Amino acid sequence: MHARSTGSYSLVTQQPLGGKAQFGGQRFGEMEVWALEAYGAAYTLQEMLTVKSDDVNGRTKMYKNIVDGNHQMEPGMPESFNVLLKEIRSLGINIELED
Amino acid sequence: ARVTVQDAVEKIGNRFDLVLVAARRARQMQVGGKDPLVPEENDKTTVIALREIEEGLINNQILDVRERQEQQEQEAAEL
Amino acid sequence: EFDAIKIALASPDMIRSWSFGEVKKPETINYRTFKPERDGLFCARIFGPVKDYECLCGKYKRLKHRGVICEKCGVEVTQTKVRRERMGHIELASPTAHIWFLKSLPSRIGLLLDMPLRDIERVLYFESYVVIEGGMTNLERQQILTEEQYLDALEEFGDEFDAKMGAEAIQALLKSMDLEQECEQLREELNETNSETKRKKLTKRIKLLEAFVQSGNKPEWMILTVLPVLPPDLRPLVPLDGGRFATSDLNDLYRRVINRNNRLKRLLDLAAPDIIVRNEKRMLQEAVDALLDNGRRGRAITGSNKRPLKSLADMIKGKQGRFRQNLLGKRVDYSGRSVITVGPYLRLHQCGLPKKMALELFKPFIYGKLELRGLATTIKAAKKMVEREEAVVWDILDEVIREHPVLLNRAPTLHRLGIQAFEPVLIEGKAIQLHPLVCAAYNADFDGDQMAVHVPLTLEAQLEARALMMSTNNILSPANGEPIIVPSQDVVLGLYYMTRDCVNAKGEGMVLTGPKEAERLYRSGLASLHARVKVRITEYEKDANGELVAKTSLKDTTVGRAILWMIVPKGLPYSIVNQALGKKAISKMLNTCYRILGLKPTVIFADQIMYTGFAYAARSGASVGIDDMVIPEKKHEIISEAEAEVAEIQEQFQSGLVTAGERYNKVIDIWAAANDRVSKAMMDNLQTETVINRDGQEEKQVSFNSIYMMADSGARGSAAQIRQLAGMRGLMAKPDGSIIETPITANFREGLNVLQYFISTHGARKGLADTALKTANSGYLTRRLVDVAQDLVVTEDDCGTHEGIMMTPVIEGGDVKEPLRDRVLGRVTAEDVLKPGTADILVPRNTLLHEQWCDLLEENSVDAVKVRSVVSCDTDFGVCAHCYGRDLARGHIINKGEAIGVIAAQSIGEPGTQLTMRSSIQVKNKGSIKLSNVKSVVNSSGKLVITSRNTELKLIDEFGRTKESYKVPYGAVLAKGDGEQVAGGETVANWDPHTMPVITEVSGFVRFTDMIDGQTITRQTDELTGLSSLVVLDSAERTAGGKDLRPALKIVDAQGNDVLIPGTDMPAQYFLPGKAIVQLEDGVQISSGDTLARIPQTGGLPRVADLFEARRPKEPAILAEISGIVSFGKETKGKRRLVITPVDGSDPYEEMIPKWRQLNVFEGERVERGDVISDGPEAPHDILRLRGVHAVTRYIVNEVQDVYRLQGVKINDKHIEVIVRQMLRKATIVNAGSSDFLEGEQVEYSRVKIANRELEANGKVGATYSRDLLGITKASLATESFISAASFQETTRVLTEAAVAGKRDELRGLKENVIVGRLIPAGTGYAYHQDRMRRRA
RNA sequence: GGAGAGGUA
């Protein structure tokens, strides 16, 4: 039996750690993302992989809002995607976001 | 308390825009300083919004027209 | 904000533009003072500060000094986040070649420069020479030279011709070329000479060359001169806390390449002999190869443990890469995990939750409530109060939980029902209690399964949970309408034991005043739970317009059934709870209740069913004992007789009277017979052993033996397990597929001895290993499927078309495997059906065929219906609402803006683990006989002899609706003609499936024309009898003499001239094929349809995988490409030739036939396109290109549905049609017309369709396209959006190709929008995306 | 942080 609300954070990619030894959270695996897409559920998926795990400013503001009793979010963009962008740009490939 | 959403879906026959309209109403109710149109029995805002939708005294179009009316008065509130 | 992702090549200047400095030293950390080095791989002056607003030396350490730099460090005092976003750039002394653009297979350098990859491989590693311009001399542009050859050439030609060696040479050669001019030359050359393989080669090269000019990439940028470096923090140097550091191999590769670079820099400065610099440049090239991608070269490099290091290209590919590890599915906060128990006191819409998990998940909400209530005027005090949980916090926690759903999920979540919402109820335990009905949906046994809990935070998430995933909204499985909360295994036993009747129980025959009276009687103990009794009941029927009408009557039932009736809702006929109520009956009862009384009554009724079932099952005390496994008393006699029977055949084969194979087969057969007899005897003695007096003398009834009561009701175990428990347990198979001739003659109530147990052990281990491998493979299958249909979303209201498909009941030769009413239930019609009162419009043309219309079809005995199908909908980038049909997970038409591709893929992949890995026509029903495609004559016996191949016979009942079908082989004799009446069990036709005749058409004399013994045939006269016999020598059998002539046989008359074919003017001479044995003589009378001569003749998961992947079969049944007569040509070049000549058109089509193919047709026969030329599996590609689209789709759906329903699993057809629609999506242009598409381009079908459709509005002529079928594995890669492809397999190839082409992704699928982290255009986000499109545009 | 081994569903 294990639980996690807000604990540590990995280093290279800002996501909650894994395992019970560290105070890590569970893994919303790929197949679960498919399952959520199968419903019409879109908001829950978007928050569940934007503001609950990765987008740092998003989750700080989410915590502030929740404490202040006003449920909302500020999505932003995942940090892991920026990691991928830099890593793929480290080759000769020039990849960027347009207008 | 609610267990189903069937009748509410009957009032709003899409089951997707239902979510958005109910969310907007609950947002008015929680952070906004509005009040319910149905007596509350120690129920949270989401369920109260769904119950309001159920009786058919709030749907998308009436919500929009009420928003327009209150915004018109707000424009008239500065004088 | 942004809207598109652009990808291209990076020129060295741009790379310098990115960078914020230059790396020059391979040193990182001092290991004593943990500051970085001067300007080493890490650094502060290049990348940034180490602490927030802290200069390195400490001259300024406050945010007041933001922006300024230190005068000794030069660092920029600012946040430390800059340390994750600045990039350095190394300077490379020598040019070097990007490995990806060299060994990509195909290699872009190789075919852009158009040199064999071997020679570039040699040149780029400094073991040869290549000329650059090579003019004014014997040499050409790009001849290769060995070292000695170069020395000799420069010796004889010490003039100015340049021949260099390695990366610099490649760079100069590439930079010294003009692209578009080369394109002109190559298109001019491709004009012709030649379109055999040079056509393909030049088309590919021109494609690449025009790709460069179209984009903004210079060719030479594929040669790296400046190499960027990943920021420091994305490759952190984690300490091991043992005073040392971990491996962190990326920094190792960087230091290695920097060492090589500095070595070469020094050696170039100091002017060493050329050998040294060449060696060092080779080493540098290898270092860069290692850094960019380690392994693709001949040998990987390792630090220790003999394990290769992680190159950059290894941090993207594979499960460990970003895409499939940290980008599609992340870890997540606000979660928990636990074990699950049953707790059957819960409503259907709630689940237990331990106190501790509840107080740990919801902590922020508790803080919010505490601060709102003023019990803690800060977050620290509130955190303290929660930490030591003063008694107040528990009531607060209960207050928070009131209406806050959570999500429960299980680990291998296959289908959409694997993750479901619930309300939480706090429990003083440590295990998640789960309602026992949903275990079927989760496939969650309680033998230690763990489940994970998530909480939705925002408001919209809570409402989405409640209105989409709350368990009382998923009752019908998306795969098919069947309910998914069927009472599973124990409640069913309780109900079955409740609705029974002993012939004479306590209190039999009295009369009661309604159900509750019976309940009171039973509880008081005066009447047993089941005894026949008359009771008055008041049914309700709403046959009126939604009005319930009460009607009372005096039924005769058993007190158990009367008690049960007290539970059911109002509007259900009483006969629904009158039978024995097995499992199937309960499922049907729930289905009818749902289809009559909406939803809420059904859910409440299901809950009440569960409660009563558990209660009365517990009352039953249905236990299992060792006396309840009765061994039939005749088992020993049966087995002994079978033993003697085996012994006699053993004796026969001892004396040689029989052969080994026949002895073996007879032994197996008789053992099977003995096994069946034992099973039957056991079952008969088990199911009716109860004989009990009926207050008179004696009678018998259905037995109460516990095992039988569990098996028959359907709780657990079929009859096979009962056979294995009581009767002999069959024959066991040894590993290599053989069947042991000695069965196991011992059940489990008795003991198995050693050997029998050994054999059973082998069988069990085979089963276990098979399950493991099978599930492993099925996972990959489903992952492939969901990645080719993920981008499809019903996105309109009505496409407005008329084409559909003909839905009919399926026939396999025998009975109906699937009626019509279950194939068109819930699919809109295409063309209004006309009742068989023809001109009587029974249904409108665009109505949904729900249950009532299905009944109307059934009573009128409709036969075949035109139904709109999702394979032909004309909407672009999605399908229209009507074309799809009924949602199938809730009883109404599909809502606009719904993701169907994903649910279809999951529904097909979910059952993938339940599959397995490795004469004469006898009409059996009275009815009329009809024949399709009959070309027949009447033979000598008055029967009907057929002269066509596609002749098919249908037996139609008296109604006029087809009921049976059978395939009629060619030249098969038929007792009947057409439109007769057949008696049941009548043998209606017969044929000789062994050998093929030379059947003629009409009577006359038969003349052996061009039939010469010695060099054309052989006089192999029959020797056992002595009649005339002569055998045609095949082309191989005959010598050179008879090669030219063609043996034939022309029908003639007494006059001697050639009698003509009836009807037409082609003289009737039949071309004798090789190896044709003839028995009749020359000029001998024969009758119509007589034998002129004789000429002799997987199902597992891999089948589904192969069928969807569209793999070519082993032995392709080649088809008839076009219509017209056929002929032969050049022969015996290891294969035959076939040519086909239309009636009037050109006849270019010729083809090769391997000799082992039994062409059923002869040359003089005219064949229409689509008729088999050989026999065997039919590939899908030719099916598509010949019989259009509505044939390949039907073939695929029929085959897959066969493989599934043979294992008793139901899947609606739509889920396969959608996959096929997404599969056949690329089109190829035959004629451009007034369009712009080049001749051979393979273009997306949607683009060409819209271009032609809009162009025809003007006076332009559109293009012509031919649809193409690609297996899913190839179809998902050839997609416009390249991020979708990259997240799928083999990122390297697609990524390099896209980079060269300079593609530009526009984020329209359901997957890349997940990657970027914005709303999906699938569900609720569809409204947002609609507004977003309508605003910007 | 990465490897190797064992285990559960």
Ligand SMILES: [Mg+2]
């Ligand atoms: Mg289990």
Ligand SMILES: [Zn+2]
């Ligand atoms: Zn300083």
Ligand SMILES: [Zn+2]
């Ligand atoms: Zn359509």
